[PDB]
């Protein structure tokens, strides 16, 4: 049977879920309990964490513009997701998506992770660039698994303290 229902109009779905595609929620998963995790991500949202995804991530910036802060070949880089852009991120490339525009919408597609395949979330020192803190998580449900992780980082000057230069990371904002 059609476990995930019939086809439906995507722009209309996005318009209908617009109140969820802005703070405080910011994103909405299209289908539940599927192998492909299909999400629409709105804005505005800025963040300081880098994601280490053990699988690929596909992006299609449908409305508005956004960008990814990246670590590529040991250097800080930026990949712009201009409206209309698509992009495929290889596994383990550290990325911190920034979504400055209200009313923006990006299709993001990921895969469910098998047991034992973990995701990393990392923060880096603004002063010297050294890794400050890394948490590894078996990512089953983004909504329950992720906010407390970020919250525990922000609340702890110990976790935010750079092991190299001693500078305390600013936490939630930079």
| Residue 70 in the binding site for Cl ion (CB under 5 A) | no
* Cα–Cα distance for residue pair 83/103, rounded to 1 Å: 12
Residue 62: CA count within 13 A, CB half-sphere: 19
The DSSP call for residue 91 is: T
H/E element, 57? strand 57-63
Nearest to 106, CA basis, from 76, 127, 82:
82
* Cα–Cα distance for residue pair 103/64, rounded to 1 Å: 7
Contact region with Fe ion (CB under 5 A), list: 18-26, 73-81, 144-152, 158-166: 158-166
Report, in Å, the least distance between residue 141 CB and Fe ion: 15
Report, in Å, the least distance between residue 166 CB and Fe ion: 7
- Residue in 37, 48, 50, 51 binding Fe ion, rule: CB under 5 A: 51
For tokens 């383990």, what's the residue?
92
- Residue in 25, 86, 102, 128 binding Fe ion, rule: CB under 5 A: 128
Binding mask 87-116 for Cl ion (x = CB under 5 A): ----------x-------------------
Residues in binding site for Fe cation = 51, 57, 95, 125, 128, 162, 165
| Residues within the interface to Fe ion (CB under 5 A) | 51, 53, 125, 127-128, 130, 162, 164-165, 167
């Amino acid at each position: 049977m059609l476990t995930y229902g019939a086809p439906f109009n995507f722009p209309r779905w996005i318009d209908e879920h617009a109140h969820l595609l802005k703070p405080p929620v910011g994103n909405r998963q299209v289908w539940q309990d599927s192998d492909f995790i299909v999400t629409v991500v709105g804005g505005p949202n800025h963040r300081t964490d880098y994601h280490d995804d053990p699988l690929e991530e596909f992006f299609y910036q449908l409305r508005g513009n956004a960008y990814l802060n990246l670590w590529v070949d040991g250097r800080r880089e930026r990949a712009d997701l201009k409206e209309g852009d698509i992009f495929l991120l290889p596994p383990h490339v550290r990325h911190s998506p920034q979504r400055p525009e209200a009313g923006s919408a990006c299709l993001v597609i990921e895969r469910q992770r098998p047991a034992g395949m973990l995701d990393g979330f990392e923060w880096y020192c603004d002063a010297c660039g050294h890794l400050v803190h890394r948490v590894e998580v078996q990512l089953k449900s983004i909504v329950t698994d992720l906010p407390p992780l970020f919250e525990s980082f922000y609340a702890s000057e110990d976790k935010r303290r750079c092991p190299h230069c001693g500078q305390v990371h600013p936490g939630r904002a930079a």
